[PDB]
Amino acid sequence: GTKQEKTILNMARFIRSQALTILEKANELDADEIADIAESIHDHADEIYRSALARF
Amino acid sequence: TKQEKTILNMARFIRSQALTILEKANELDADEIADIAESIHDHADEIYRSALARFG
Ligand SMILES: [Ca+2]
Ligand SMILES: [Ca+2]
């Protein structure tokens, strides 16, 4: 089902940006713990995005 | 199957990291970061169900 493939690929991609929008608001508030996790999420989502692009 | 494990396990982990950020945001009272964290949790859960369906 490409429907599932599209969700996986489009969401993983969109989460990367969302993660960065958080990382930016975090650094403003100097919220360093939130900042670190947001980076991590950005990095996990990118991995999902790469894995998907390839597999599908 | 390497991509599958990655797509599956990371979409699930992100879902957890999204809620961890939601709590810290709530404590610090960061409403914006809090709404986005929710969203990310929700989008990660979608990648998770879709992969679960696609790979299962
Ligand atoms: Ca990184
Ligand atoms: Ca890249």
Domains identified in chain A and CATH numbers: 1-56 (1.10.287.230)
The answer to whether the beta carbons of residues B37 and A22 sit under 8 Å apart is yes
The phi, psi pair for B55, rounded to 5°, reads -95, -5
What determination technique applies here? X-ray
Going from the Cα of A43 to the center of ligand 1, the distance in angstroms, rounded, reads 5
User: Nearest-CA neighbor of B13 among A56, A12, A4, A29?
Assistant: A12
Facing B40 at nearest CB: one of A18, A33, A51: A18
Distance between CA atoms of residues A39 and A44, nearest Å: 9
Residues of B near A (Cβ–Cβ under 8 Å) read 2-4, 6-7, 10-11, 13-14, 17-18, 20-21, 24-25, 28, 30, 32-33, 36-37, 39-40, 43-44, 46-47, 50-51, 53-54
Cβ contact, residue pair A8, B33, below 8 Å: no
- Alpha carbon distance, N-terminus to C-terminus of chain B: 12
Q: Is the dihedral of CA B19, A42, A44, A46 positive or negative?
A: positive
